[PDB]
Write an enzyme that holds these catalytic residues in place. Structure first.
Site, short mmCIF file in Angstrom:
data_model
loop_
_atom_site.label_atom_id
_atom_site.label_comp_id
_atom_site.label_asym_id
_atom_site.label_seq_id
_atom_site.Cartn_x
_atom_site.Cartn_y
_atom_site.Cartn_z
N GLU A 182 0.88 -1.04 0.08
CA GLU A 182 -0.26 -0.10 -0.09
C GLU A 182 1.01 1.37 -0.14
OE1 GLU A 182 -3.28 -0.21 -0.19
OE2 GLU A 182 -3.77 1.88 -0.46
N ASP A 183 1.32 1.57 -1.12
CA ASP A 183 2.13 2.66 -1.51
C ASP A 183 3.54 2.65 -0.92
OD1 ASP A 183 0.24 4.12 -3.27
OD2 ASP A 183 -0.92 4.94 -1.84
N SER A 184 4.02 1.56 -0.19
CA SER A 184 5.52 1.61 0.29
C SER A 184 6.31 1.34 -0.68
CB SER A 184 5.22 0.65 1.66
OG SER A 184 4.48 1.32 2.42
#
Ligand SMILES: [Mg+2]
Ligand SMILES: [Zn+2]
Ligand SMILES: [Zn+2]
Ligand SMILES: [Zn+2]
Lengths: 51, 404, 98, 82, 378, 67, 263, 49, 115, 46, 52
Positions: E57-59
């Site tokens: 998740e967007d990491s």
RNA sequence: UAACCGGAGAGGGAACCCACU
């Protein structure tokens, strides 16, 4: 109605797929600061003594 | 502990958790629990409260602990679903042409917690032993669960005609006696909708079992995705150049059909729709041509894509993106709108100083006949900035009303 | 002390009307990156009040072609109110009409 | 109210199930006598959960009806959900 | 590098990066902003893949060995001013406070000070350490010494002593602290695709090409299709072409002399797949990945939002003055706010004793005596 | 600031290449000829020299703190 | 139920790199040798830096960081040293470390380039990779100095391996490849015609990939190991094999102790 | 004497007007620094338009 | 400051064991081997060597967490045969493989040098 | 006890006593920087 | 205490060679701030050695 | 027919600006 509290932390979240939904990762620095008060009983007196 | 992200809107924004201690200096939470918290891992912060009395410790453990909070009373669905990578690789994993060798099967079985230590008979025994991804997912699914769902690309006629219970496309997920017989699993099976497989797991089986059912899916699928892998690239957005010519012909014919409507309007040959003025019926007809053009180009793009595509791998799985995003990357961005209308005449009877006055054309009022892969012309770039600005305003404006 | 007060604090006016005078003029220069310095030195401000639900001044207007950057704005409660300055855009300085 | 007139549910609610466990494990933490032959565990909350499954907790619950009256239900007298 | 004379410039809250690089893919308007003289970022090698799940998740996943070699390592300068003076006899003065002479003194070591009342540069300091020893006389003496900010934990860079416009002695002390990228540090691209580090694997654990090229950064493909940043993909393609050609890539917007097919036909000549995809092998098992991975040079940035400037906890720390609630702020050792919406969520759970534990016992437990006849406090 | 010692990706030494690279650029050599004149085959090593900006030279234009 | 017998042939040998082929082994053994090539080969790099003067414009930890990445020629000394965490000595002895010294002051008006030549070793055999390049090339830059600037420091070099820090990584690039023509189809090309052929492929131009065989396993592993300059590339491989064998022997000893102490 | 006016850097009455880059480096100033700001109690201030 | 030190990936703490053995109760002749301060480097070759033994019915490994430094190997063998002797036979075969490989490599190195 | 400082302008080391106005004996410059400390600094090369 | 405020050197264990300063001390162990890194550690007194 | 040591919760507020999710 709403106010500041003790025994709370705040930091940045980051993913970890490798632990269950009911678990949460915490840093040691936060955990070494926030405390929980256990009452002594003859069960845990040795563990609390070493602690 | 109790644990929240700060715009707490419903009671799944503060859920109990068990502490596990890890080296580095961040909070770490499982990826399904991102969905109630509305977390993003893009610099988010979350704050943690520790309950100090033993009585309130028991109270959080029995009321607000997170596997007890799976199904909400807001909309009688589960809140949490498989998300963002485990979902895509589930869809790729449970397809019909997925076969696993003996070492890969034992490596995957190493990551099940609820495994009896018994290796199932493979789906193929000779020439060589091969297991199937459905056959492993049947080991993931707990107890004796029975449900029937449909895959996203399930055709409508298929239930009517023959091959109803033997699907050629491997749609119509059927779980029976705790075992996946057939079907490909998407958002509509493992997501947060009603009657999804997780919801049947929460209702028939306990919350404690559904907890392990989450964690087992996430572990074994994230450890199969080291073998399969999943990307996106510039090859995923490119097309055939047979498709490109079809898109250009659709745009050219629609743009000529705009001009003939304009000629019928200028020569007073256009009769107003009843209930409408001449201006609004002209606008209605222009937007009808442009929306039909965008839809036809989008459908041509969707027909063009291959099975091996990585945009399609996400949209079919429902993990990320939609069917309009693929069209808007490949085929046509579309028309840019401001308050539902076209781009208004900010100058004196024109839009930019590069356009002739009284130009009601598609290019003069916000339509973008280029894609994101082809780049934008500067007029279209400025119009797209003007389009995005409206939603960027509405996001900031909406919060101070909704919280109040 | 008047010039120095008004530039040091930002209350643009007399020290007596500190609550009356508009603030936010004369900010502390952002010295984090050279691009941040240049963008802070080239910045406009719309003195219509914040946290108002009127979207129309916040919108991107057609007269912004080539004079104000359409992309660049703060995402918070000041979308469209704080706006930076395009590259070849120049602001007149005034001369006599005589 | 009398034992004839018990009009509330025979099921223990989630809130009662939380608070009975909290206030029992607090007592066990203060060296109250356990009602169950324990199997070597030392966590008082696990001991309280064991006594709740064993149906041996020495607490009764006073449910205030809205008119003003109440009912006294033994923990042994009602059905544990889980 | 925000300015060239950053070492003379005594300034609070400075960040400079060890090895900045100009971007391999640039527009022609960076020549005039002087961006290739003071750049902010490093041309990384990104791979857009779902590798382990720590990037989801967007990491973003990072190469630990590259971070060991100096990748996005920065250094943070914090400076402290202090000015002695204010009364008829209440003179502030820089000196070493002595426990026999001076009244109020922290447990902290004061031996790190020189006898001027200052530290010399080159001394390791930490949280709750003096930096400027200053005392005022007591009408024996009481200190007003300034401490290093808690959890800052750096090394003193330089110390300057001078006179203000009031003719009083004045000191400014600047302190280094290097900042190695760890997990949780917030990175971004030039396309609005931001993200915090989620894990760091070494070079052995990282996937690799037919050569020994391993990606410095791995991002998730599920940040692309909803955001629709196709300029990120074209940047990642043009960067591979430019790093193989020797040219600096040209990404001016409305060029029309460059598109994806020309870049692909250039990249096909250097011995790669024309769409940027490559065959990476698993770093753990060695088996090649069934999908082919999109990989190449992309210019990433390092944002100032570390995690070590944001983490803080509390267990019955200091207390406010008027109402006896905890303080606010990471610096004042404050407490989090259990505001009006959080008490409301705990109402909706039906957990009233946790609600009482939050709003009464964890903030300000207190007792009063009240008359039993009239309800005014006695 | 100054040229890094090793390539971040590869780990090949690039720290000795910089002055030789500036020497080769002061000739008929292009960048694409100067890099493989120095033996940089992988593009991870080529971006280390090709995208470097040398700010140590601008830092040496200031007078030092001592003498 | 027994071990397989692998064979080796070298196709290239250079001071810079080794290129070779291993037959008749498993993918896991091949990857683990590729992986011990990166992480677990002991080498000498400097790890203890004391700075006595630093009047330059690069601060102290920047300089110590650039000093740690300088490789040091340790071909046979690293076999006979000890880890400093294991040696009986106090602070440093010549059986556990190597001492370096750097005392440079700029006095002329020309910018003084401090290089790796200006490091003075204690042992003549353990030195940076300015050793032999005859049969003109520069040396590793550390800092540039203005007139009036200087630096003085004293350093010590330990034995370590690249699982601690990347300064103990003896290799530059470890190219690794099995099945160049996609015969096992561990990868799946959507358009196989678009892919360039490998260096180890054996195909005509007409064919794009090998026909699938179900019975095949991965064999014929192609390695190219490029050194940084500290170790010879031929003795990275022998030291990695010896390290992996020593690790397995220690694990077998611990398991033998556990089993005979359990019964 | 009326007072003193705070004055903008790199202006026509700042002391850095028309200086060469070498002279700016002699004054410990940055030649890339654009100016356009005031220094008031040793703090840069910038008038937002 | 929450950074763990770099040596912690491979150094046993005082009181830790390199190896721990636990019988698996679910099925007969199965056992779990927990190794401290090791990673995929050792577990993958151990698994692959165990899978050449026909008397081994199950063999696999996992890392429970990447930030942790532990590895778990689950072995199940046929009755008449033990997972422990299967493990040590896999080790003593894998060492033989590496020794043979080392000998043949140095011989081929010498033969490349002018031969 | 002497506490040698360094002139910012003329780079002259000069000893100034405690409780003295800051001034360099030559060029009259009023900014001093202190000096580098004597105690040990030891760094990892990491 | 005598050890508090003294620059010390860890002479045994994995931390061997790290210079630091003693913040706190007991007879069994002591707390040392590392000069190299931004971390304070607890080490036994047998490993420590006073320097300077 | 002997032997010296000892003291501890500090520490404010208002206003404005910038930034994060
Ligand atoms: Mg977010
Ligand atoms: Zn490289
Ligand atoms: Zn030694
Ligand atoms: Zn002077």
């Amino acid at each position: 109605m709403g106010k500041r509290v003790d025994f709370s932390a705040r930091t940045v979240i980051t993913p970890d797929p490798n632990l269950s939904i009911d678990q949460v990762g915490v840093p040691r620095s936060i955990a070494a600061n926030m405390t929980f008060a256990e009452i002594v009983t003859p069960f845990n007196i040795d563990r609390l003594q070493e602690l | 502990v109790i644990f929240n992200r700060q715009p707490t809107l419903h009671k799944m924004s503060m859920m109990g958790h068990r502490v596990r201690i890890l080296p580095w200096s961040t909070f770490r939470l499982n990826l399904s629990v991102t969905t109630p918290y509305n977390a993003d891992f893009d610099g988010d912060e979350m704050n943690l409260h520790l309950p100090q009395s033993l009585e309130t410790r028991a109270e959080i453990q029995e009321l607000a602990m997170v596997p007890r909070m799976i199904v909400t009373p807001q909309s009688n669905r589960p809140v949490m679903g498989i998300v963002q990578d485990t979902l895509t690789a589930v869809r790729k994993f449970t397809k019909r042409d997925v076969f696993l060798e003996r070492g890969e099967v034992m490596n995957l079985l190493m990551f099940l917690s609820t495994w009896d230590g018994k290796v199932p008979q493979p789906a193929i025994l000779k020439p060589r032993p091969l297991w199937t991804g459905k056959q492993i997912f049947s080991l993931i699914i707990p107890g004796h669960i029975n449900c029937i769902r449909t895959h996203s690309t399930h055709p409508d006629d298929e239930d009517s005609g023959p091959y109803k219970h033997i699907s050629p496309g491997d749609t119509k997920v059927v779980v029976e006696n705790g075992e996946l017989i057939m079907g490909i699993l998407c958002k509509k099976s493992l997501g947060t909708s009603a009657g999804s497989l997780v919801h049947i797991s929460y209702l028939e089986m306990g919350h404690d079992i559904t907890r392990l059912f989450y964690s087992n899916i996430q572990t074994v699928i994230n450890n199969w995705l080291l073998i399969e892998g999943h990307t996106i690239g510039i090859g995923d957005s490119i097309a055939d150049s047979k498709t490109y010519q079809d898109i250009q012909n659709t745009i050219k014919k629609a743009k000529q059909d705009v001009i003939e409507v304009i000629e019928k309007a200028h020569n007073n040959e256009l009769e107003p729709t009843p209930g409408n003025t001449l201006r609004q019926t002209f606008e209605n007809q222009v937007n009808r041509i442009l929306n039909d053009a965008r839809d036809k180009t989008g459908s041509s793009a969707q027909k063009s894509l291959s099975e091996y595509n990585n945009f399609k791998s996400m949209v079919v799985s429902g993990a990320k993106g939609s069917k309009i995003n693929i069209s808007q990357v490949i085929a046509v961005v579309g028309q840019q709108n401001v308050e539902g209308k076209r781009i208004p005449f900010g100058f004196k009877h024109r839009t930019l100083p590069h356009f002739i006055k009284d130009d009601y054309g598609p290019e003069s009022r916000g339509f973008v006949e280029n894609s994101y892969l082809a780049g934008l012309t500067p007029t279209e770039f400025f119009f797209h900035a003007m389009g995005g600005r409206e939603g960027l305003i509405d996001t900031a404006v909406k919060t101070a009303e909704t919280g109040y | 002390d008047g010039l120095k007060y008004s530039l040091a604090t930002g209350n643009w006016g007399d020290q007596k009307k500190a609550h009356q005078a508009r603030a936010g003029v004369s900010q502390v220069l952002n010295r984090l990156t050279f691009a941040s310095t240049l963008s802070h030195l080239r910045r406009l401000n719309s003195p219509i009040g914040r946290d108002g639900k009127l979207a129309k001044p916040r919108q991107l207007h057609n007269t912004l072609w080539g004079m104000v950057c359409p992309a660049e704005t703060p995402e918070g409660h000041a979308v469209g109110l704080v706006k930076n300055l395009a590259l070849m855009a120049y602001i007149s300085v005034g001369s006599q009409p005589s | 109210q009398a034992n004839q007139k018990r009009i509330t549910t025979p099921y223990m609610t989630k809130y009662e199930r939380a608070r009975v466990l909290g206030t029992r494990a607090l007592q066990i933490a203060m060296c109250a006598p356990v009602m169950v032959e324990l199997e070597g565990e030392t966590d008082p909350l696990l001991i309280a959960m064991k006594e709740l499954k064993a149906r041996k907790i020495p607490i009764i619950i006073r449910r205030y009806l809205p008119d003003g009256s109440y009912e006294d239900w033994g923990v042994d007298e009602l059905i544990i959900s889980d | 590098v925000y300015i060239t004379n950053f070492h003379v410039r005594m300034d609070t809250l400075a960040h400079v990066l060890y090895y900045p690089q100009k971007p391999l893919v640039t527009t022609r308007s960076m020549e005039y902003l002087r961006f290739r003289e003071l750049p902010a970022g490093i041309n990384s090698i990104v791979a857009i893949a779902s590798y382990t799940g720590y990037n989801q998740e967007d990491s973003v996943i990072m190469n630990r060995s590259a971070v060991d070699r100096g990748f996005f390592r920065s250094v943070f300068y914090r400076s402290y001013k202090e000015q002695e003076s204010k009364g008829f006899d209440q003179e502030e003065v820089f000196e070493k406070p002595t426990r026999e002479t001076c009244q109020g003194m922290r447990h902290a070591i004061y031996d790190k000070l020189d006898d001027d009342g200052l530290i010399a540069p080159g001394v390791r300091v930490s949280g709750d350490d003096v930096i400027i020893g200053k005392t005022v006389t007591l009408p024996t003496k009481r200190d007003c010494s300034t401490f290093l900010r808690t959890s800052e934990t750096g090394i003193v860079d330089q110390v300057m002593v001078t006179l203000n416009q009031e003719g009083y002695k004045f000191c400014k002390i600047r302190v280094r602290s290097v900042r190695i990228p760890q997990i949780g540090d917030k990175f971004a691209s030039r396309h609005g695709q931001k993200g915090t580090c989620g894990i760091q694997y070494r070079q052995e654990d990282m996937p690799f090409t037919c050569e020994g090229i391993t990606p410095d950064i791995i991002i998730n493909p599920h940040a692309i299709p909803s955001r629709m940043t196709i300029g990120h993909l074209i940047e990642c393609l043009q960067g591979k072409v430019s790093a193989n050609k020797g040219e600096i890539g040209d990404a001016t917007p409305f060029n029309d002399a460059v598109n994806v097919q020309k870049i692909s036909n250039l990249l096909s000549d250097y011995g790669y797949h024309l769409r940027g995809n490559e065959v990476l092998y698993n770093g753990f098992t060695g088996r090649k990945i069934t999908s082919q991975i999109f990989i190449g040079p992309t210019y990433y940035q390092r944002l100032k939002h570390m995690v070590d400037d944001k983490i803080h906890s509390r267990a019955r720390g200091p207390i406010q003055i008027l109402n006896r609630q905890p303080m606010e702020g990471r610096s004042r050792d404050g407490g989090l706010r259990f505001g009006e919406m959080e008490r409301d969520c705990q109402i909706a759970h039906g957990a009233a004793q946790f609600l009482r534990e939050r709003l009464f016992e964890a903030s300000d437990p207190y007792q009063v005596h009240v008359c039993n006849l009239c309800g005014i406090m006695a | 600031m100054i040229i890094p010692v090793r390539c971040f990706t590869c780990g090949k030494i690039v720290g000795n290449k910089w002055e030789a690279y500036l020497g080769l650029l002061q000739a008929e050599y292009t960048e694409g000829d100067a890099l493989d004149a120095l033996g940089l085959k992988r593009y991870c090593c080529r971006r280390m020299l090709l995208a470097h900006v040398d700010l140590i030279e601008k830092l040496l234009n200031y007078a030092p703190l001592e003498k | 139920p027994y071990a397989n017998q692998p064979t080796v042939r070298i196709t290239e040998l250079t001071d810079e790199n080794v290129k070779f082929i291993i037959e008749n082994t498993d993918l896991a053994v091949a990857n683990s040798i590729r992986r011990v090539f990166i992480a677990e080969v002991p080498i000498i790099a400097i790890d203890w830096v004391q700075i006595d003067a630093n009047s330059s414009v690069l601060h102290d930890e920047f300089i110590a960081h650039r000093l740690g990445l300088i490789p040091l020629t340790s071909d046979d000394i690293v076999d006979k040293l000890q880890y400093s965490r294991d040696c009986t000595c106090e602070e440093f002895c010549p059986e556990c470390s190597v001492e370096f010294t750097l005392d440079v002051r700029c006095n002329e008006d020309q910018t003084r380039h401090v290089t790796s030549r200006d490091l003075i070793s204690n042992s003549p055999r353990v030195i940076p990779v300015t050793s032999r390049n005859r049969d003109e090339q520069d040396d590793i830059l550390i800092v540039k100095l203005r007139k009036g600037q200087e630096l003085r420091l004293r350093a010590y070099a330990k034995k370590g391996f690249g699982k601690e820090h990347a300064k103990w990584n003896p290799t530059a690039g470890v190219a690794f490849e099995y099945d160049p023509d996609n015969a096992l189809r561990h990868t799946v090309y959507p358009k196989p015609e678009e892919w360039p052929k490998s260096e180890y492929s054996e195909l005509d131009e007409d064919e794009s990939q090998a026909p699938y065989d179900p019975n095949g396993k991965p064999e014929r592993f192609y390695y190219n190991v490029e050194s940084c300059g500290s170790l010879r590339p031929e003795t990275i491989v022998l030291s990695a094999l010896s390290g992996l064998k020593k690790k397995l022997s220690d694990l077998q000893t611990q398991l033998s102790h556990e089993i005979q102490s359990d019964v | 004497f009326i007072g003193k006016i705070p004055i903008m850097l790199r202006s026509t009455y700042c002391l850095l007007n028309g200086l060469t880059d070498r002279d700016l480096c002699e004054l410990n100033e940055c030649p890339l620094d654009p100016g356009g700001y005031f220094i008031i109690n040793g703090s840069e201030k910038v008038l937002i338009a | 400051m929450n950074a763990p030190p770099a040596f912690e990936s491979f150094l046993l703490f005082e009181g830790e064991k390199k190896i721990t053995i636990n019988k698996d109760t679910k099925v007969p002749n199965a056992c779990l081997f927990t190794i401290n301060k090791e990673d995929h480097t050792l577990g993958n070759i151990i698994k692959s060597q165990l899978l050449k033994d026909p008397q081994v019915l199950f063999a696999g490994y996992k890392v429970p967490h990447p930030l942790e430094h532990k590895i778990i190997i689950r072995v199940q063998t046929t009755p008449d045969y033990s997972p422990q002797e299967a493990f040590t036979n896999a080790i003593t075969d894998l060492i033989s493989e590496l020794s043979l490989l080392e000998e043949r490599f140095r011989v081929a190195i010498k033969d490349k040098q002018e031969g | 006890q002497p506490m040698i400082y360094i002139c910012g302008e003329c780079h002259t080391e000069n000893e100034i006593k405690s409780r003295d106005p800051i001034r360099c004996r030559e060029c009259g410059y009023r900014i001093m920087y202190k000096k580098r400390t004597k105690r040990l600094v030891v760094f990892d090369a990491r | 205490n005598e050890l508090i405020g003294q620059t010390v050197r860890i002479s045994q264990g994995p931390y061997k060679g790290y210079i630091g300063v003693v913040k706190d001390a007991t007879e069994s162990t002591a707390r040392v701030e590392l000069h190299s890194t931004c971390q304070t550690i607890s080490v036994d007194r047998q490993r420590l050695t006073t320097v300077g």
